[PDB]
RNA sequence: UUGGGCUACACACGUGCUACAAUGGACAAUACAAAGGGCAGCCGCGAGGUGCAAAUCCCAAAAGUUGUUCUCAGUUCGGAUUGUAGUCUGCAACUCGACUACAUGAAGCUGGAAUCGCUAGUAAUCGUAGAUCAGCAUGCUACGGUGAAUACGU
């Protein structure tokens, strides 16, 4: 807003893996407030997780979120005639929103025929530098070394 | 396998497989299931010759078909054939309960002619 | 004929086709619709619908 | 529809003009304003001049039309166009 | 005053409701609200039929949770349309009411250009009540349940 900066909302960790993380994950997840089904999705896909891969699903999920979260993004710009595509460094607080917000799009658009599975299925890909979210944020990457040029700007 | 003269699916519950038949719905198709002392969770290829039999038995007592489909047609007949308000509609091609036709009759009506 | 078809039995009876049980010839052959009782009572008609619906004899 | 046990519902004046009619042979055009009135059995072979809101048409009855209000033979409506 | 029309129907636009399904459908069991209204007013598969003038009696929660089943199919999604048989109100449901049961089972598999609302108990979603009112609410007004994401900056 014109004024300025709002305050942020804290979250409590969640009761198995005690980690915020968890808990905005669900809250992505979640649809019209129907919070047990989203908790019931991640935990689901954290279990298929943990015995796909042979690790702690929480330790996956960390690895996972890291390969999708990007460093650099795109902005866009009206200069006298011509937009520019300003390269901007992601705040850490925004890093964490992307990372869940695209792990939870691309999960939606995968082919497996839960949610659970396809969630699951990100995160290990994610946590393999594959899938859709990690593809995702080498294409921002992508775009925004190819405008380091315009970094001038603001 | 074939039950009324339609080969209903093969693959699922009887139930579900039954209300391939013109003239049998869900709670048809429950009832013909209790008669016929047929569980409802059977696929239909895992029905026995004898548990087919008895389901082909209880499904002739029911009005189904091409029988099911000629008393209809005969009754939409009858309506225009002594040109009632009903009749009417149903020769032109619109809707015959009192539904509004200024929108929304595009069942009855057909794609839209712009 | 040129050089499959046997005679199956399909009540039965012998008949010959290729979609492959004793009989009182004493072999054996691979073995819905009988077919429509009135099965149904026709149409009352408008009239004694009518006074069937209403009680009006 | 009418409640069965309810029967089925004529108007009084329209049924006296059927009865009077009862046991002749020539039958005289019945002019009514009653749309809402049940077509009896024992109306069939008359005829009932039924006022659609302007004028009274001729509605010949037969035993398939048993049941049907008189209003649904005399339409109100005029439409043949787009 | 009786009857008809305001409900027409090739189309065009606005506002909504229901869907296109697996974060789901069906079946079974089991929890948790708030705000209001009330005098001749508050056996049948079914709609329905035969104590209280109020913190007292009635109208009267769902989403949710736990299990079983369905297995990605225009289908066990969807319930438009139509046929038949009924219930109730009303003198009277043809034009032109609401609801129920059986059958039928349309388009529709996330929508072009474009465009709308919303900053927190909000949006979204789920039910509830009232006025009008014999009968008729996907509208209006009101009530609670679950309950987000984001705001770097001009
Ligand atoms: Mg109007
Ligand atoms: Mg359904």
């Known amino acids: 807003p014109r004024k300025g900066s709002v305050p942020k909302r804290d979250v409590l960790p969640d009761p198995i893996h005690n980690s915020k993380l968890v808990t905005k994950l669900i809250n ?83 082919g497996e025929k839960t949610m659970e599975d396809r969630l699951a299925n990100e995160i290990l890909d994610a946590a393999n530098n594959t899938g859709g979210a990690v593809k995702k944020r080498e294409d921002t990457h992508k775009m925004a070394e190819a405008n380091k040029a315009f970094a001038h700007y603001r | 396998a074939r039950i009324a003269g339609v080969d209903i699916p093969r693959e699922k519950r009887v139930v579900i497989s039954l209300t391939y038949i013109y003239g049998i719905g869900t709670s048809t198709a429950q009832k013909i299931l209790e008669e016929a002392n047929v569980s409802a969770d ?10 087919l039999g008895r389901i082909r038995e209880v499904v002739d007592g029911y009005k189904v078909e091409g029988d099911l489909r000629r008393e209809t047609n005969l009754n939409i007949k009858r309506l225009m054939e002594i040109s009632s308000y009903r009749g009417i509609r149903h020769r032109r091609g619109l809707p015959v309960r009192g539904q509004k036709t200024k929108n929304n009759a595009r069942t009855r009506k057909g794609p839209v002619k712009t | 004929m040129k050089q499959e078809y046997h005679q ?49 004899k | 529809a009418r409640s069965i046990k309810k029967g089925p519902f004529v108007d009084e004046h329209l049924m006296k003009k059927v009865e009077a009619q009862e046991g002749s042979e020539k039958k005289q055009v019945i002019k009514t304003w009653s749309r809402r009135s049940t077509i009896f059995p024992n109306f069939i072979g008359h005829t009932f001049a039924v006022y659609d809101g302007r004028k009274h048409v001729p509605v010949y009855v037969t035993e398939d039309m048993v049941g049907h209000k008189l209003g649904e033979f005399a339409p109100t409506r005029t439409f043949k166009g787009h």
């Open chain 2, 42 to 51: 059977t696929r239909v290829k895992d029905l026995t010759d004898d548990e």
């Open chain 1, 28 to 110: 992505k997840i979640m649809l019209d407030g129907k919070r047990g089904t989203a908790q019931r999705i991640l935990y689901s896909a954290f279990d298929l997780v943990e015995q796909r891969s042979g690790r702690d699903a929480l330790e996956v999920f960390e690895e996972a979120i890291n390969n999708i979260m990007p460093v650099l993004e795109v902005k866009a710009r009206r200069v006298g005639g011509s937009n520019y595509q300003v390269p901007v460094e992601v705040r850490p607080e925004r890093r964490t929103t992307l990372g869940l917000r695209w792990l939870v799009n691309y999960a939606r658009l995968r």
């Open chain 3, 8 to 56: 199956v039995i399909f009540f039965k009876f012998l008949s010959g086709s290729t979609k492959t049980m004793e009989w009182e010839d004493g072999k054996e052959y691979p073995v819905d619709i009988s077919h429509p009782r009135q099965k149904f009572a026709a149409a009352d008609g408008r009239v004694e619908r009518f006074n069937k619906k209403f009680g009006l």
